[model samples]
Target chain A: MELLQGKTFVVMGVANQRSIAWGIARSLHNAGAKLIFTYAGERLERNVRELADTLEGQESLVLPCDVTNDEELTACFETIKQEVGTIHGVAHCIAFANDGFLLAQNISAFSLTAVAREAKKVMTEGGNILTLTYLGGVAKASLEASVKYLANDLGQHGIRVNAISAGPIRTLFNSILREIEERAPLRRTTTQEEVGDTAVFLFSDLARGVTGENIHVDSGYHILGLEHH
Target chain B: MELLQGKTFVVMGVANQRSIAWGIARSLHNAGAKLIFTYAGERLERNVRELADTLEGQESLVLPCDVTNDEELTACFETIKQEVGTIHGVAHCIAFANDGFLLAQNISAFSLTAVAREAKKVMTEGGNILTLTYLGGVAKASLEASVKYLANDLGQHGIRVNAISAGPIRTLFNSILREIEERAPLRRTTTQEEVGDTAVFLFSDLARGVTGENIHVDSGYHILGLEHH
Candidate 1:
């Protein structure tokens, strides 16, 4: 039943119990891989610890490393390399910008180069690097440069970097955008479980041939061409 | 002469004279908008300075900021706040990963996460964020996950992020696969100038209603799925 039984993977960017990364972690854990977790800072310690308890025999390794700090990132990976000899994959479920900046009309706040340097430091070869993105990055709804640059640079490396642009999932990220929820095609929020299952498929052999791509998991919200349609 | 005369924009990720960013910069410069540039580090100093020289007194502001540095990023925006005041749009021409990683198999590197976060930071509301993604990201022979994530996240911000998935342009990026160039449907490589023109249209009013989508500049390659009559 476990697709990743003998495989080992490192998962980063779980902010709290409700995080999409956490959902992916649980699914990966169920697939039988030895999991190692990395949180942003001490603020998430309690929640991560509690979540770790749910895994059998404290199976997953939970650690802390800010993606912004190269030294800290290196140290975190060093620890993982020591504990686990070789890894099969990496799930990068981490993203943050100035809060409320999501709704602002300023593009200068985002920088594509800076983000690529930080993420490249820890990515392993032939390993899968999955991030949570949305249809907004593809459409006029969002202005994201980092997504373009990173994908270009990372694809050259064989790491198979990709993202799941899940449709309007009812996650913490959307807790801030209650206004536009009804305007979506489904007129309903996507569930965390659906996202979790999709993440599971991406992490497993089912996505072995997939890489450097962004799959739309957003339940047709992005495909809606226009409001009149 | 002024295709984007009334427009104001921010351009990020120019590395050197030969960079793809430079190609886009040239296109936008010709379109006639107020241009703002962001260079990654000391490596880009001379190249950017030379490129700016060709802008013909367009009153451009060139700044230095790395997306990974949170404080620096914040400060960079503050600078833009002081200089540009209000921008009509932004262009994100950036991608990073270890060289040679592209030719490797899937999972050769793990930097996709860093890239998505970078894009999220600078996106503006009602503005457009354009990325350069490859068909390889979607089809089996495409780029990879990183580009997919960029297209996905930026679409959510209402900024209309898209990739010009050009089919194997002859550049530093595709030089490694010189022999396989004919394998593409077009049997040749795309030019940098073609990509530049598309970026200009996307940034200008011509593409006002277009958002969260990718327009293939790949010589009708993506339409390979549907056989031509």
Candidate 2:
């Protein structure tokens, strides 16, 4: 039942357990993947480790990987190379950096390129890389575009890159959620669980034949038109 | 290991062993699914049956179902209902009318809606409906849109709709195939086996959480840009 039994993965951008990345991490954990958790700075390292403690395996690595810093990013995978020897995949869920404005592009979109370069160095065994996005959300057009080009660049290297465009999941605003619930085909919005499970699919051999594609995990909401059909 | 064990799936548009639908059927059959094969016209009936006899299950049903004819399609599902009781999925691998012209729209895109209405009626246990598509293929933008709207329309009934966009696989034209082989990420072109394996994912419980998604089985060319890097 463990899709990733004995496999290793790196999970980036987990901020508390509420973030979509944590949703992905938890699902990846349940899938029996040995996960490496990365945080932006020292302040967040404790945050990531605190959450990682809930898992049964204490051997899972937690490290610092501020995506904007080339040295930190490169060293992160470098350390993994020496420790684990090989990793099968990554769940890159960072977005909307600690600061806003110019930094968003730096971390939100460009980080994929940065991470891919470093991750490729250690993925000698081949691997899958995933990121989260909402096509309608801000900054992800850049994110989605990066996934495409990176996929093309990394394809020959035996690495597959892809993205998931998820629907909004937030607190309050019943009217907004209500509209999605009423209009969407699934008659609902989207959930972190759904997005994470999708990550499971993308990161697993089940999607081995898939690449350079963006899957919408919005409960079929993105397909809606004004016309009621 | 079988994804579709004890499940019955209707396979449409298998002309000879080379068709993409045959690829999907073989994959589905390998996944332990009992298949019901459908042909577009009477002349093709023998061709489908002759091919089908290769399978072990003589109990598997084969029916004549020209998509453009409403009566033929409606009665086809009706027969499946009385015989099989319930179906779990369908592979609609059809396109280009016998004569072409406006019939493209009649059969290419419109048939999905027609098939959905009929398939939905028999899918009381809920199921997946799959169609073979190539976004780059002529008339498929219309085909893609039909998948979206039908997914939205059918979501409430617990039916999931999706498509597989495959890359080129044909005889001769080494120049064309070689370009895809050289340029695409996987450093290769798509294959019927790859597309069929992908259909197995979309048609199974693995994608139960997914709907209205188009998964590209192209080795990784859809993400290509003019840039050489």
Candidate 3:
């Protein structure tokens, strides 16, 4: 559980307790990781503050980081570099939900790339970077490609870039959740706890040789093809 | 240089010292790795034997491993498991120079998939796997996709799969090697030594957080554009 002991992770985008970012943070906390919570806007700042307080023994370094704004990101990371001196990982759970496909892709699909560019500067020694697809209509193909290119760019620097393709968050109707449970080989939907643990592993020495990969946290859903369904 | 000390690596496909497999083997030995050289056939077994002898202060363990045979592949891994108890990495460099596109791809492209399936069995603990292309016609798209799928499958076991998209090995005429040297961004042709060092890095703990990655060791050749050339 102490895989991330003495290692600080800057987790971005905790909109609420149900947020995947919070789940990731909680797991990182349990794994003995130092947490730096970053919220998108003032609207959610209070939410983040409260969550930061809930983690017992947490260092509590919450900050504002709007992923849409480039300057803010640079400033936020610069601030972390000054405060923490080094960061082991970053969990990028921020995403945009929009009606227009191109706009959605523009904001969310490439945001990881921008985040990676800025984050690498602070990761002077070596670090792991993580992201997930909750689907605000960003083409994940876009995400996957950036992941590869980012990995190649960062490999020489000893920095790693990776993503998680987590299972459904059960935002669907009750009936759908039940059906998913029935169909899935594991006979259950993915929980935030599971994803958090997985993210923690990615941030830990256990997953040290893993970069440019999209780890699917689905409980056998991808394998439970039409034949199983 | 001590990164791979006490670690054993199975280097497959050394037709001769000029082979990329030998380059990787030489680098691994320099890094203090215990060497297990695997030749594709008895015809080249003598070539592999001589190269293994060249690696001083190295515990020599050589075996026959034909990439094309399933039974032989399974047998070789089991034998390694018996003698070495564990293998830390494998540098697969086997490929056929076939005439037909399909045959070439058949021999070279998916051979990695077959190798990975068998290799993971003996990699009881976390280990690294490596491969390269000498064009025997495997559509690298084929190799790239397997790297992803294999990474996903082996993540739980803590075994990592990766590839090196090395620069063109200069078997061509003198003019070609000189042309590559002039055109490359680094203003030099890619050398076995450079690629060998990169191989050592990949097989080292320094590259632990990387899997399913196609690292290019091409002396900036991949990034050099038509404008530069």
Comparing 1 with 3 on lDDT, the higher-scoring candidate is 3
Q: What is candidate 1's lDDT per residue for B79-178, written digit by digit as tens? A: 7766655566656555432232242212211322343344345444345666555332322223234444444444455444455555555554454235
Question: Using TM-score as the measure, what is the rank order of every candidate, best first?
Answer: 2, 3, 1
Candidate closest to the true structure, highest DockQ = 2
Tens digits of lDDT, candidate 2, B18-47: 777778888888878999999877777887
DockQ (CA atoms), all models: 0.02, 0.50, 0.05
Q: Write the per-residue lDDT of candidate 3 for residues B1-229, one digit (tens) a residue.
A: 5667878888886777677777778878877899888777667888878878877895788888777888898888889988877888788765332243345345657678888887787778777888775421237777777766776577557676777766666741466567656654334455566556667756765444455666655544454343234
TM-score of each candidate structure, all chains considered together: 0.44, 0.86, 0.54
Off by over 4 Å in 2: A2-6, A29-32, A41-47, A50-59, A95-106, A134-138, A170-172, A225-229, B41-59, B95-106, B134-138, B225-229
Q: Which structure among the candidates has the greatest TM-score?
A: 2
TM-score: which is higher, 1 or 2?
2
Tell me which of candidates 1 and 2 scores higher on DockQ: 2
| Cα DockQ of the candidate 2 complex | 0.50
Give candidate 3's error at residue A26 in angstroms.
8.4
